From TrEMBL, chains B, C:
Lineage: Bacteria, Bacillati, Bacillota, Bacilli, Lactobacillales
Name under which the protein is recorded: YopX protein domain-containing protein
Transmembrane segments: none
UniProt cross-references to Pfam families, sorted A to Z: YopX
YopX protein domain span: 5-143
InterPro entries listed in its UniProt record: CHP16711, YopX-like_C, YopX_protein
Length: 144, 143, 143, 144
């Protein structure tokens, strides 16, 4: 099963927004985003009260980039999203260079890039395990 | 890189709703659904006008079951979702069980059940190809 | 990155032979098997001394079925081969059978049948882990 | 199923040997290689006659690197082995090199390195398809 959960990088404000709801037209294009809402009212006469939101008509270039949760967690229990960048949590002693690996989606599955292992919960936790160190938007220096 | 697209089975109305937007609390529980909306503003400024929707306030148990698109298509160009049931498009073997393969997501990937080939667009189309024949909600006693 | 290792089911003796070397002719059909050999040279002129072997000419039906090692081990350190049958080793909660999963190779990977998980070392060992309980030849009626 | 088929790179002579039979002890060390054999003698009384061969006796380090067939074919029907390098057979354009990926085995599967696609027969052949254009031993600068 996979519970749909999304975060958005606001490229104009340079801010990561958690728990957002992307809204699409019937043609697979994002047209709005709800960043906060609450449900109000009584049983049978309830409503969705949108607190904060934005739409593509407000912008020449809509500044939100959406990323979905993989439903997997890292060694410290942090939920892994598309765009996260992970590293093997090696001991400090005899420290040796390690590469970082970005999470992406293709061909029906989430992949970590440049790694021989299959991306799955057991591989994330195996031996010393993997940790999310940042993401491609906030931390592009991790892949330099 | 997967464009999010969802459908919902409404267990109360016994119907499939297309192009829905599920709304979750910050704790993994679905608390509302938007089934139609428009953007309007002339300028309003622009606003989201919810057309049809439901919330968990309205129910003892929220009757909507959400399914996400894999973004892959079957041999007939049908978009494949979680809960779809696929079969290989071969001749029909009369009076014997036909193998059926439910689509689900787990542990980082979508997969089809009971099949040695890996679920991916090229394998869906290879040879005679696979077709969606229905899903586990609209067609409950097939599997 | 995969050490070639083979075992053979002897369908005449009904025994499993370990560390065998299958030999294939130019038609890619198995023609012989080496079950024991030594290297006895002296010292810049070495030789392969085959000590135990068999060939398709010594039989009407060559009674050997070859299975290759996956290179992976089960939770008890047992090397896993094609044709093995694995179970998840959760405690016996009184009176229910563990589901069984045969190992095969196809289309680029070794895999376990009827399972949502990727067949890889970490999944084999995760939590209670998986154990080999038999194989399709020694235990033809297990599945 | 997979018919075991092996090739070996002789790293002393710098030659690829086709269709070899690798011989291992029980500790997983290759100690011999049969490059040619035939079966001889009376039915019921037959023998393996070893033609070309080599053993680890003659060597400080046995100079042969074994690679197994994946069982999969490229767009030209060529059997793909570990160590092969594949390219996507898109129309070639001036001064643009097509991207290359090495075949490896790890942890239960064969795969193409640095490519987020399931390595399977239908993906090898899909759309423009992939072709074997060398291997890491005979063409050690090819990946660059």
């Amino acid at each position: 099963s996979l519970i749909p959960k999304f975060r958005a990088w606001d490229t104009y404000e340079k801010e990561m927004l958690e728990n957002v709801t992307p809204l699409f037209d019937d043609s697979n294009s994002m047209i709005a985003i709800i960043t906060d809402f609450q449900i109000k009212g009584s049983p049978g006469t309830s409503e969705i009260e949108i607190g904060s939101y934005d739409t593509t008509f407000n912008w020449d270039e809509f500044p939100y980039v959406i990323m979905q949760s993989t439903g997997l967690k890292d060694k410290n229990g942090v939920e892994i999203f598309e765009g996260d960048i992970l590293v093997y949590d090696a001991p400090k002693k005899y420290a040796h260079r390690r590469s970082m690996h970005e999470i992406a989606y293709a061909d029906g599955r989430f992949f970590w890039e440049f790694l021989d292992l299959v991306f799955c919960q057991s591989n994330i936790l195996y031996r010393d395990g993997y940790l999310v160190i940042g993401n491609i938007h906030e931390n592009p220096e991790l892949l330099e």
